[PDB]
């Protein structure tokens, strides 16, 4: 559950929709908008996907992530079809806070070619949802995240 909370700061987290064909490998960008200018120190965010339609092959930090080698991690919980992100400005001196809107991560996924098996549709949608989401500033004050789910629109091949 993403907990309903009250705080002094807020941003928006968006899954940017993609239209693809069954069998495609595509990138799904995930964005932050309205990032507080005083900056994010750390965040921990989960997404879920439908493993019947989607295979996650790679997760990469986005351009707004500072010193990703040290500040950015992810883990795919395959059993739960969950992608978990953790960011922290590792050196703790307020110099690598996230203060800019843009892409925070890109997923590279394969759309399973057999998704239309036993189906009479030519178009399907697959939802990318959220779990827990926690963000804070340098002073450990919470920053709320308004989460907006996303969809992959999938066209049958041929």
């Amino acid at each position: 559950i993403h907990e309903a909370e009250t705080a002094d700061y807020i941003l928006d987290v968006l899954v940017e929709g993609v239209k693809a064909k069954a069998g495609d490998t595509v990138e799904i960008p995930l964005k932050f908008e309205n990032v507080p200018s005083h900056g994010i120190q750390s965040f921990n965010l989960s997404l879920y996907y439908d493993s019947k339609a989607i295979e996650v092959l790679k997760v990469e930090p986005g351009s707004i992530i500072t010193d990703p080698a040290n500040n950015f991690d992810y883990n795919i919980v395959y059993k739960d079809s969950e992608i978990v992100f953790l960011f922290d400005d590792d050196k703790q001196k307020g110099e690598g806070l996230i203060k800019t809107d843009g892409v925070f991560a890109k997923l590279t996924v394969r759309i399973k070619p057999d998704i239309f098996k036993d189906s009479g549709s030519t178009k399907k949608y697959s939802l990318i949802t959220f779990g827990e989401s926690n963000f804070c500033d340098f002073d450990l004050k919470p920053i709320l995240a308004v989460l907006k789910e996303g969809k992959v629109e999938i066209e049958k091949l041929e």
Partner: protein, 72 residues
């Protein structure tokens, strides 16, 4: 009290991770919670250090569901 919960707010989340990092860096001198070793030594080797920080990272990434050290 809760293992990994270094600010004693009932839960283990990013704030505990940031606090652990600052504590090991000596950016802060101590944790807000009382018993540093009970809350901060999550693998139970009676040391608080970057191994504990890494366990917190693993926990927050859902690589593990609990810490090696337990209340039981």
């Amino acid at each position: 009290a809760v293992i990994g919960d270094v600010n004693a707010d009932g839960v283990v989340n990013i704030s505990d991770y940031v606090l652990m990092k600052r504590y090991i860096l000596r950016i802060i001198a101590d944790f807000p919670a009382d018993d540093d070793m009970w809350v901060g030594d999550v693998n139970g080797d009676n040391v608080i250090n970057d191994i504990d920080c890494n366990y917190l990272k693993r926990y927050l990434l859902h690589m593990i569901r609990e810490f090696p050290k337990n209340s039981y």
